[model samples]
Target: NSNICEVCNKWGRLFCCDTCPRSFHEHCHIPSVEANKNPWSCIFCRIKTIQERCPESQSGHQESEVLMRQMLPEEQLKCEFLLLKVYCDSKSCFFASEPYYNREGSQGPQKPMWLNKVKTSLNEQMYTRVEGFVQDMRLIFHNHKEFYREDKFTRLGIQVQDIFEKNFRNIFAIQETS
Candidate 1:
């Protein structure tokens, strides 16, 4: 007998926190654990540990800022990637659903206008950098098709072939017609 995970409230293989009485399923744990590290603590325990180490004079906001600054580089990168993913997902949904609201109030997908607005927001160097990043991402997806499925790429409209042929610009680039 093991108790249900405190996080998910589901019966599963749970990892009991070494520093606290609470337990969590490996998948339910925030910032999920990959390896079975000995003496692991849950998120609550980790926060408590940080708070204990924080100076008495430090405000909660300051403590949080300190904690954020102390986050591991990989964690920070993951956060950035997730933020990008969310932004893309939201934009894709909006373009897919919303009618084009031009001066004449014509109804169609306003993807081109959206792409133009995004292009204007970036400077030359930033545009170049973003284009390079998109190219790299396309290559990665192509080479690692097993890891990233076709639907995921199709949803984002990131494939180079689509970019060149369909005029389906994504958050990364305005597709260049071949």
Candidate 2:
């Protein structure tokens, strides 16, 4: 068990996730880990409700039509898993928490996008097309690199970007039609 909160990097009352080495100081966890959920599984390790599915062969526009007709469980699960993976990159979680911070200047991100917003939109099933989710995901990374310029934070963004990109393809890669 980690002796400190994965987000705060400090010792305190910690909730140890059953499935991973990560630990958190309750409120530090996204959505705030509830103590009642026994044998706790962090978002990154929990998968009680997803299904095994295949890749799609339709265009994003076409998929929206299909999506309207039926919001596939697999698709939703994929989105959740994608978000969780990004959050699992603990350093990236910093951006999820009011990433704008002191960058109150208008010259920063023209459209602020963060993991928290993405998760909220995702939870509400508010995405019209999966592309919007991907777009937002990319936007967070872009803003990260743009805002931080060059530093550990920028490199941290890159780390999470690679994680998100690779998993996104694994989750939603377009299958070539024969």
Candidate 3:
């Protein structure tokens, strides 16, 4: 029954989740699933890795407090996939790491927020609007520029931001803004 990847909808050597009807390729799934273990559970079926129910995390989006769009289960799946794609990169971990403190470093990010905490907030339903989550991601990239200029990390931020935006638009199914 597992002819294609549930995540990418492409054909490959699929890994079927022991607990669900879903299946996926190693790279297509976030966290890059390893086919080494037995009785592998899909991300949805897994009790630990979870969280969505979001609105348009679109470009040029701003100003929101109310729950403008409260997505249903299927729609929530859509937003989670966007974040899932963003998590596929090694640099994603970098953005998720704890920022340096001004007390320790000469100076620190004036407003600090990281990717992991963003997801934590996502899980906690801290964001009433979807655009808030997207903005938080962009904030991470913007904050990265505050500390480094000549360093490779600054450029890494640039590179990571580019991929994240690209992933954002495609996964969120947002057309280009005019």
Candidate 4:
């Protein structure tokens, strides 16, 4: 039945404040009054008073309040995009697979099959056709000096040229075997 406040060295029975439910010994109380069945304020009140007076304590409250503020629209959108990318890249998911196209009650093309079909469609003739199309496009790009001042078309043309070279190499390899 020995009750002593651990915070303050005071000899008295420890009792919880009826209002704040903080423990305090009767001697530790500001008024040094024994806590009867009646409500009493103890050292806990003095601690609250100290916190109200302390600049650091007020700053801590302000920091928490700042953290509680709602995120901006752009921040929320970026967070959502990041979450979606994470979800899509999860090991169990196959996000990079070919798009599904429903045709009457039948399942769409598999990824491998779709890729093979695309490759077959992009044969030597197709590659040559694309090269001619790109060449014509480049002429228009060359005519527009100020319209494409950033050299974006040149960079895109390099990428297209790489694709053309790769396709031509494959076509030549196939022709050699045939």
The digit string of per-residue lDDT tens for model 2 on 75-112 reads 56667777766776666666686565355432577888
> What TM-score, over all chains together, does every model reach?
0.35, 0.59, 0.59, 0.20
The lDDT values for all models are 0.39, 0.68, 0.65, 0.35
Best-fitting candidate, measured by lDDT? Answer: 2
Candidate 2: residue 116 lDDT (0-100) = 83
Off by over 4 Å in 4: 1-4, 8-12, 34-37, 46-178
Count of clashing residue pairs in every prediction: 0, 0, 0, 0
Over the stretch 1-178, how does candidate 4's per-residue lDDT look in tens digits? 2244533535566776655655655433323345364766544453455445653543322223332334343222222222222222222022213334444544432222222222233322233333332233233223332233454543543443344333333321222221
For candidate 3, report its TM-score: 0.59
Give per-residue CA lDDT, model 3, range 58-79, as digits (tens): 3333223212556544334545
lDDT over C-alpha atoms for residue 38 of model 3: 87
**Candidate 2: misplaced stretches above 4 Å?**
1-71, 101-106, 173-178
RMSD of each predicted structure = 16.5, 6.1, 8.2, 31.4
On a 0 to 100 scale, what is the lDDT of residue 12 in model 4?
A: 60
